[PDB]
C-alpha cells in the first residue's frame, strides 16, 4: 500500500516533473424490539463485520443507567403532584 | 424443473434447457399447467433456428385454449399471432385466417396485429 509515493525514488521524480452505507446482519436483529441495532461509530465495524462483543458492550452500557433513570419523568408519588425531574431542576436553581 | 430451465435459458445453455423443460412437462399432473412451458419452449427452438420443430409445440399451446373452453390467456395470444405470421410465409392464407379471429380478444396491440393480418389474408383468400 505504498501508493507509489512512499517510494523515495518516484516521489522525487514527481516533485521534479511538477516544475459507506450500512445494512443490518442477521445477528444484529434482536428478539425483543424489531428495530435492529445500528452501530454508533465505524470503529465498532471491524472491516465491514459487526463485532458481536462490541455491539453487546454498548447494549450493556445503555441498559445500565436505564435502571437508575427509572424514576425520572412519568413516575409520580402520592401526596406529591410533581415528579422528581424538576425536583432537581428547582434544586439546581436554589444554589445558583 | 421449470426454474432450472429458466436458469439454463438465462446462461446461454439452450441445448440443455430443452431437455429440462421436457422433463417438467411429464411431471405436471394437469395439462393446463403446461401452457406457460409450451410457449417458452417454442422460443428456444426459434433461437436454435429449426422453425419446423417449434411448430409442434406451437400447436399444443394453442390447442390447450380449445381444450379449456376458450381460456384466452396472454401467453396463447402471442402464440396465435406468431403462428399466423408463419402461416402467411407458408402460403396457406385460409389456415391462417381463423387464427387471427380467435385471438381478437387480447391486448390493444394484440388485436390490431391480428386485424391487419386478417385483412391481408382475406384479400388473398
Amino acid at each position: 500500500a505504498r501508493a507509489l509515493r512512499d517510494i523515495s525514488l518516484f516521489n522525487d521524480i514527481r516533485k521534479d516533473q511538477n516544475s459507506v452505507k450500512y445494512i443490518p446482519s442477521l445477528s444484529a436483529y434482536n428478539v425483543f424490539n424489531e428495530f435492529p441495532y445500528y452501530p454508533t461509530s465505524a470503529s465498532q465495524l471491524l472491516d465491514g463485520k459487526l463485532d458481536e462483543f462490541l455491539m453487546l458492550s454498548e447494549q450493556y452500557k445503555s441498559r445500565l443507567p436505564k435502571i437508575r433513570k427509572l424514576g425520572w419523568n412519568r413516575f409520580k408519588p402520592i401526596g406529591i403532584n410533581k415528579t422528581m425531574y424538576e425536583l432537581e431542576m428547582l434544586r439546581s436553581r436554589a444554589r445558583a | 424443473w421449470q426454474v432450472l430451465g429458466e436458469c439454463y435459458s438465462k446462461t446461454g445453455n439452450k441445448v440443455e434447457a430443452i431437455k429440462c423443460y421436457k422433463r417438467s412437462i411429464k411431471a405436471s399432473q394437469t395439462v393446463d399447467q403446461n401452457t406457460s412451458i409450451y410457449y417458452r419452449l417454442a422460443q428456444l427452438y426459434e433461437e436454435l433456428e429449426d422453425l419446423q420443430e417449434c411448430k409442434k409445440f406451437m400447436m399444443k399451446c394453442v390447442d390447450v385454449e380449445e381444450l379449456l373452453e376458450g381460456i384466452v390467456t396472454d401467453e396463447t395470444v402471442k402464440a396465435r399471432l406468431w403462428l399466423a405470421i408463419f402461416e402467411i410465409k407458408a402460403g396457406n392464407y385460409q389456415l391462417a385466417y381463423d387464427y387471427a379471429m380467435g385471438v381478437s380478444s387480447g391486448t390493444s396491440q394484440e388485436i390490431e396485429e391480428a386485424r391487419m393480418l386478417a385483412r391481408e389474408c382475406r384479400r388473398h383468400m
Binding site: 507509489l4 442477521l26 458481536e52 462483543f53 | -
Partner: protein, 658 residues
Amino acid sequence: KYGPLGITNFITPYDLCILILIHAHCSQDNGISVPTAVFLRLISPTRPSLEWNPLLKDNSNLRSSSIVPPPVLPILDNIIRILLDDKDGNKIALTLMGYLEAINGLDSINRLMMDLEKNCLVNNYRSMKMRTTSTRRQMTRASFLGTFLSTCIRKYQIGDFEMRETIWINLQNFKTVFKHTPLWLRFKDNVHIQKVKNCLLANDEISVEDQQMVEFFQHFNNGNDADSKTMNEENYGTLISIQHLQSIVNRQIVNWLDYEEQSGLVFDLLDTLSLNDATKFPLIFILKYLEAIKENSYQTALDSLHNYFDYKSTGNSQNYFHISLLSLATFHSSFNECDAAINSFEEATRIARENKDMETLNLIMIWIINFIEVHPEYANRFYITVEQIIKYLKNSSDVEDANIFSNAYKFETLLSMVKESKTAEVSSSLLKFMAITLQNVPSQNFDLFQSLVSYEVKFWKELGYESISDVYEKFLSKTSSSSLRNYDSSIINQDIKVAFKALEEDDFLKVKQYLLKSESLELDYDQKINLKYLRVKYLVKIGDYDLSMRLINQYVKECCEEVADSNWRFKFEIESINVLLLSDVGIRSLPKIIKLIDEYKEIGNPLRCVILLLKLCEVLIQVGKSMEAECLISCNLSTILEFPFVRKKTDELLESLS
C-alpha cells in the same frame, strides 16, 4: 487436552492465565519479572483482527518480518511448557501453578479483578509520577498490556452472574484436565507452590468453622463420585474468543500453504464446533477447502467454498458478491475447467458495475490476465484484449496503486517476450517491472518476486547466458507454485525436468512410461507444450521420422494460430531442421533457416543467431563442401564459445573437421 470447542465473548480460562502472570509481574513482592518474550507470545494472538481474503490476495501483509512463535492453545499443559523451558522458568511456572491453586472460588477470581482495576491499572502517565507511594508497579491504559487488561476488565463487567458462574465451572474443568497428565506428576509437590499459595491465601478471616463448610460447598459441586453427581448441562472443555481463534487458523493455513506446531490437536478441536461457532467464525469452512484441494476432491471442495461465501457475505457490510464469483472462478481454473470459469467470471464484471465502486474493478482486471497468463489460448474469448488493459493500468493513477504498476509492467514483459519484440524493448520493459518490485518490500509481496525470478531466468536463458540464469535460479522457489493453477502443478513441473535429464542420460524406458501419463493428465498450457515438445525430442532419438515430421509441423502450425507464441515456434522450428539434416536431406531446410537468420539478425538475440549458424554449418558439411564451412566456422569461432549448452555440439563438430 482435547475437548469440545466453543466461542465465548467472556473471560476464557486462558485469559486468566495471562491475568495470573501479569499480577505476579506487577506486584514486585516476589521479584519475579516475566520475560518479555513470554508476554509477546501470549497477549499478541488475542490482539484484535487480522482479516484474510480467501484468494485473489496472498500474504500481502500477514507475513511478519520477524519470525514469530506459533500461538498457544488454551490448555495448561501447553502454557506451562513455555515457562518450564527456562532453567529458572520452574520458578516462573510454579508462580502460575501456585496462583491457580490459590483461586478456589468465584470470590477469589473477583479479588484478582478488583485488585488490578483499583491499584495496578492507571488512567494516564500524568498520575504515574504522583503515585510514587505505590508498592506495586502501575500500568498505563495505552501500553501494550494496558490496552489488553482494559478489554479483559471490560469483559468481566459485561456479564451477569450466569457469566461468572460458567467461568468457574470451566476453569476447574480446565484445571483438573492438567491434573491427569504426566507433567503434573513430575510437579506433584515442589513446596514453592505451598509458599506462594500461602502468600495470597492469608487474611482468610476464618479457619475453624466456615472453612469446614467452604470445603463442603466446593466438594459437593465437584464430582466426588461417591454418589451420583449433581446433574448439570454439558460444559465445553475449552473456551476461545474469536480473535484468538483467528490467530490459530491464520497461522495454520499459512503454515499449511508453504518451535513445533500441533496439527493433530488443532484439527481435532476445530472439528467439534457446535455449528454455531462456525457461523460466528466462517473461516473454519475454508480450512476444509484448502485441505480438500490437497487430496483433489471436487464435490467436497465446492460445498465448503460455497459455505464460506454465504456466511461471509452476510457478515460483511460491504458488498462481497463481486468477490465470491472470482474465487469460484479461480477454483474452476484450479481444476482445469477453464470454459466453466469464463462464464462465472463474466457475471463478476456485471455485478461490479452495479456497485459503482472503482477500487474493485482494478482487482477484476488484475485477475483477468492472470487467468490469461496461465491459459494464453483463451485470450481471444475475453471481451477485452490484453493490450487494452496494459494501456489502462500504465496510466491508471499516480497514488493509491502501489502494486498495480508492478503487476502492469510484468504483463507487458510477457506479452513483449511472446511477441518476439526487439530485445531493446524487452530489457527496458523488464527493467521497469524489476525496478518497481524491488523498490517496495519484496518479502511481503512474495508472489510477484517469484514471478520476477521466473521471467528473468527465462529472459536470460533465451539469450544463452546460463551464468546469469544460475544466479537467479537459486532464488526461484520450488513447490510454492501459485494460486489458480492446480495444486499438483509443482509435482508435474519437477517431473518434467527429470524426464529431460533422463532423455540426456538415455533412460528411454523412464521417458516412455512418462509419455503414457501425458495423454490422460489434466495439464496447464505451459506444461502442455513442454510435454508436447518432449514427445518430439524423444521420437527423434528412436529413429522414426515419418511420424515425427508429420507431428512437429502440426505443433508449430497450432503454435502460430491458437497461441501466438514465437519462442515456442522457434524451438519447434529448429527441431524440424535437425530431423531433416539428420536424414541426410538438409537441403530442403535451406529456405527455412535463411529466412530465420536475417529475421533474427534484426532482433539481435545472439543465441538465435549462433544456433542457426551450427545448423547451417552442419548442412554445408553433409553436401561435400566442408571447405567453406571450416572457413565460416573459423571466423565465428570466437563468438560461439560464449554459449555453454552449444559448446558440446560445437566441440563435437571440431573433432569431425580435425
